[PDB]
Write a protein that holds these residues in place. Structure first.
Motif, PDB file in Angstrom:
ATOM      1  N   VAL A  98     -22.240 -75.058 -23.667  1.00 32.86           N
ATOM      2  CA  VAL A  98     -23.507 -74.470 -24.052  1.00 32.86           C
ATOM      3  C   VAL A  98     -24.069 -75.283 -25.219  1.00 32.86           C
ATOM      4  O   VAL A  98     -24.080 -74.852 -26.389  1.00 32.86           O
TER       5      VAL A  98
ATOM      6  N   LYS B 206     -28.272 -70.419 -28.578  1.00 31.37           N
ATOM      7  CA  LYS B 206     -27.795 -69.246 -27.826  1.00 31.37           C
ATOM      8  C   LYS B 206     -26.912 -68.385 -28.717  1.00 31.37           C
ATOM      9  O   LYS B 206     -26.875 -67.197 -28.586  1.00 31.37           O
ATOM     10  N   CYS B 207     -26.223 -68.988 -29.666  1.00 32.45           N
ATOM     11  CA  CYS B 207     -25.372 -68.199 -30.562  1.00 32.45           C
ATOM     12  C   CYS B 207     -25.666 -68.291 -32.041  1.00 32.45           C
ATOM     13  O   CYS B 207     -25.435 -67.321 -32.781  1.00 32.45           O
TER      14      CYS B 207
ATOM     15  N   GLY C 163     -23.530 -60.623 -24.838  1.00 30.93           N
ATOM     16  CA  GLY C 163     -22.622 -61.183 -25.832  1.00 30.93           C
ATOM     17  C   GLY C 163     -21.446 -62.013 -25.318  1.00 30.93           C
ATOM     18  O   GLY C 163     -21.035 -62.951 -25.960  1.00 30.93           O
TER      19      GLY C 163
ATOM     20  N   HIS D 199     -21.602 -65.492 -19.074  1.00 31.53           N
ATOM     21  CA  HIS D 199     -20.739 -66.066 -18.042  1.00 31.53           C
ATOM     22  C   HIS D 199     -21.339 -65.878 -16.619  1.00 31.53           C
ATOM     23  O   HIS D 199     -21.287 -66.797 -15.781  1.00 31.53           O
TER      24      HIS D 199
ATOM     25  N   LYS E 113     -20.271 -69.512 -14.590  1.00 27.73           N
ATOM     26  CA  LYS E 113     -19.001 -70.049 -15.030  1.00 27.73           C
ATOM     27  C   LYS E 113     -18.545 -69.340 -16.296  1.00 27.73           C
ATOM     28  O   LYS E 113     -19.359 -69.058 -17.177  1.00 27.73           O
ATOM     29  N   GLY E 114     -17.239 -69.110 -16.382  1.00 24.69           N
ATOM     30  CA  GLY E 114     -16.607 -68.397 -17.482  1.00 24.69           C
ATOM     31  C   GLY E 114     -16.020 -67.077 -16.997  1.00 24.69           C
ATOM     32  O   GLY E 114     -16.400 -66.559 -15.935  1.00 24.69           O
TER      33      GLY E 114
END
Ligand code: HEC
Ligand code: HEC
Ligand code: HEC
Ligand code: DXC
Length: 71
Positions: free
Chosen positions: A24, A29-30, A50, A55, A60-61
């Motif tokens: 990412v 985004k964070c 969060g 994901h 993915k994730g």
């Protein structure tokens, strides 16, 4: 800095930062989120945008219980 583990009662949830930095590249985004994001995080956020929700959108994730939570 070190990775963090969220101490969920059902099982520890690892947050590996390097994987996230890599996958990412849009840091915003964070990071540089407004005030309140430390106080705001919880089970609703984690299971929503969060953690899990991101994901799901990215395709993915981990999205299954045992893929995030591990004793
Ligand atoms: C959420 C999914 C994140 C994304 C995407 C990025 N960062 Fe991050 N960062 C996040 C957390 C929760 C933390 C503290 C916990 C931890 O595991 O370290 C950090 C920490 C950093 C740091 C300090 C340590 C380090 O990265 O080596 C930096 C310098 C940092 N974050 C920068 C950064 C950049 C440049 C990102 C995009 C390329 C990036 N982060 C993504 C959460 C998240
Ligand atoms: C987007 C903004 C994300 C947020 C918020 C969170 N995650 Fe994430 N994560 C994201 C992507 C696109 C990926 C794939 C990276 C890969 O290399 O597979 C991940 C990956 C993970 C992983 C696995 C890392 C690995 O080496 O396979 C874990 C364990 C993980 N993510 C956990 C996690 C948690 C606990 C989060 C909230 C605290 C979280 N992620 C947020 C994208 C995004
Ligand atoms: C990552 C993408 C997750 C997935 C998939 C699931 N959970 Fe989760 N959960 C996650 C985090 C990071 C947290 C902690 C939020 C925080 O406050 O830091 C949680 C929380 C829970 C809880 C509450 C735990 C507590 O309050 O101590 C439960 C009961 C829980 N999670 C269960 C659970 C189940 C059954 C899941 C599959 C359906 C599931 N989680 C997915 C991260 C992630
Ligand atoms: C703000 C972002 C992205 C999600 C969103 O859009 O809100 C979220 C994603 C992961 C979240 C972090 C996960 C680990 C930590 C959980 C703590 O209980 C509160 C602070 C931390 C450091 C959280 C702060 C913030 O809540 C973050 C970085």
């Amino acid at each position: 800095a070190d990775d963090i583990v969220l101490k969920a009662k059902n099982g520890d949830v690892k947050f590996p930062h390097k994987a996230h930095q890599k996958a990412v590249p849009d840091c915003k985004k964070c990071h540089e989120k407004g005030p309140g994001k430390i106080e705001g995080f919880g089970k609703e956020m984690a299971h929503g945008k969060g953690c899990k929700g991101c994901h799901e959108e990215n395709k993915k994730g981990p999205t299954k219980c045992g893929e995030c939570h591990k004793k």
